[PDB]
Amino acid sequence: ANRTLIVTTILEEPYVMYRKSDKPLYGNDRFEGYCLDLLKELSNILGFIYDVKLVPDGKYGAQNDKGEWNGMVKELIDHRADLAVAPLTITYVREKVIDFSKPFMTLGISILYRKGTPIDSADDLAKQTKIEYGAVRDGSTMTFFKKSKISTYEKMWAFMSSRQQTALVRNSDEGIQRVLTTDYALLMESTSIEYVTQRNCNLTQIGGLIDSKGYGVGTPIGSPYRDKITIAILQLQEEGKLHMMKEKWWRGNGCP
Ligand SMILES: N[C@@H](C[C@]1(C(=O)O)C[C@H]2OC[C@@H](O)C[C@H]2O1)C(=O)O
């Protein structure tokens, strides 16, 4: 039989979450979400079983000043996993070091905050001095700011980086808690903003999308699975299955 593929992933609602059960769950059964459904579909099409393993460092992946990676990206570079199936953003810097499938979803960075302020854009947010802001450490949103040559975003990066211990959060849950309990706005991806703002009516998006990009399945460079996964994604796309999966995991409207 074909070797069981190792899948690196990360907890991120509603892509990957612990299943709620009153009885013990083991192995893959512990998890559910859009990305687990995606894996069930991909594995049927490609003919494999898999072992889902949460990334040990809890990070998506960024490189330090020495060019050393962490998170799921490092797991792929180091051939610790066969696939990364997660809301993993397809970026220029990552594409040079891993192979991504074609995208299964598109999104852009925007701002999550509480309601009640006149802040209407990133320009507004960068200019004012009352509300702090940041991003999840070692993800693509942090990297977007670090690499930007747009003045507003360069200033925002300098601010986040100056207050890195403060401004850059460990994960999306910490970021959202910070938004809810302190004067802090979180830079994050639009599909996640859509999800949370339909569940907690104290939260809102500020402004529009600042960029546009996709999520893809990651594989190590040269992986014989990447093209097969791309073909499977296109199948699911064209059959309307990806659309159905989005509806299943995002439904339904909870806030005015
Ligand atoms: N998709 C990103 C990770 C992350 C980000 O950098 O925005 C962290 C986490 O942040 C909350 C929401 O944006 C979903 C997740 O995206 C990545 O692939 O690095």
Side-chain angles (χ1 to χ4, degrees), residues 1-64 66-129 131-164 167-250 252 254-256:
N2 26 66
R3 187 182 47 91
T4 298
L5 299 190
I6 298 173
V7 175
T8 186
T9 193
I10 195 166
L11 297 166
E12 191 71 60
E13 305 183 9
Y15 300 93
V16 181
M17 320 175 315
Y18 288 115
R19 176 172 278 110
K20 290 188 180 75
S21 178
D22 60 354
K23 290 291 184 175
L25 296 167
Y26 304 96
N28 300 344
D29 293 343
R30 295 171 293 160
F31 307 111
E32 68 179 349
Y34 177 102
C35 284
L36 281 297
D37 287 358
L38 182 59
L39 267 161
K40 293 176 185 190
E41 297 286 344
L42 294 172
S43 60
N44 258 40
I45 295 162
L46 268 73
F48 64 87
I49 59 168
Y50 49 92
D51 187 355
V52 176
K53 299 187 186 183
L54 292 175
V55 57
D57 72 3
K59 296 165 182 298
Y60 283 81
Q63 66 182 143
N64 63 23
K66 285 176 182 176
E68 300 169 315
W69 288 85
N70 56 28
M72 290 180 283
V73 178
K74 178 185 170 62
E75 294 303 284
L76 296 173
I77 292 167
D78 290 355
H79 291 246
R80 304 294 187 180
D82 295 286
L83 322 73
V85 183
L88 185 70
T89 304
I90 300 163
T91 70
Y92 163 87
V93 294
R94 290 171 170 176
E95 190 67 273
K96 293 201 276 187
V97 296
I98 60 165
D99 278 343
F100 282 101
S101 75
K102 293 264 182 325
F104 58 82
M105 197 174 291
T106 61
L107 49 300
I109 296 164
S110 188
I111 303 162
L112 181 79
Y113 193 52
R114 296 194 315 278
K115 298 164 157 192
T117 75
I119 306 169
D120 198 38
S121 65
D123 282 3
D124 290 349
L125 181 66
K127 189 189 294 189
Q128 62 79 55
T129 52
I131 308 308
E132 177 190 25
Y133 54 83
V136 171
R137 190 182 308 266
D138 290 339
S140 58
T141 298
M142 185 204 72
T143 302
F144 169 90
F145 286 96
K146 183 171 198 173
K147 299 287 187 159
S148 190
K149 292 174 190 171
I150 298 292
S151 71
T152 297
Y153 310 147
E154 291 176 329
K155 173 180 182 181
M156 288 173 73
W157 175 243
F159 178 83
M160 289 181 208
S161 174
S162 80
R163 278 202 200 180
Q164 55 80 46
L168 303 180
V169 295
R170 166 178 58 116
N171 55 43
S172 54
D173 271 348
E174 183 166 66
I176 296 272
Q177 272 298 110
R178 209 137 134 90
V179 170
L180 288 165
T181 64
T182 71
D183 287 350
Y184 177 87
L186 183 66
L187 276 288
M188 59 180 263
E189 294 173 335
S190 59
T191 36
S192 290
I193 296 179
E194 178 197 346
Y195 184 75
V196 299
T197 58
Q198 286 308 310
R199 294 168 64 86
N200 188 322
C201 308
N202 294 316
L203 296 170
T204 188
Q205 183 177 312
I206 300 301
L209 274 48
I210 284 157
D211 70 356
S212 183
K213 65 282 203 87
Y215 292 149
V217 172
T219 71
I221 282 271
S223 170
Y225 297 101
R226 186 273 296 270
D227 294 325
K228 296 185 198 166
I229 290 154
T230 278
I231 289 160
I233 285 281
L234 292 170
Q235 188 182 339
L236 297 170
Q237 173 185 297
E238 293 175 10
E239 285 175 354
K241 185 64 202 172
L242 298 177
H243 185 262
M244 191 174 69
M245 284 159 53
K246 176 102 184 293
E247 295 179 306
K248 171 180 174 189
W249 292 103
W250 272 254
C255 299

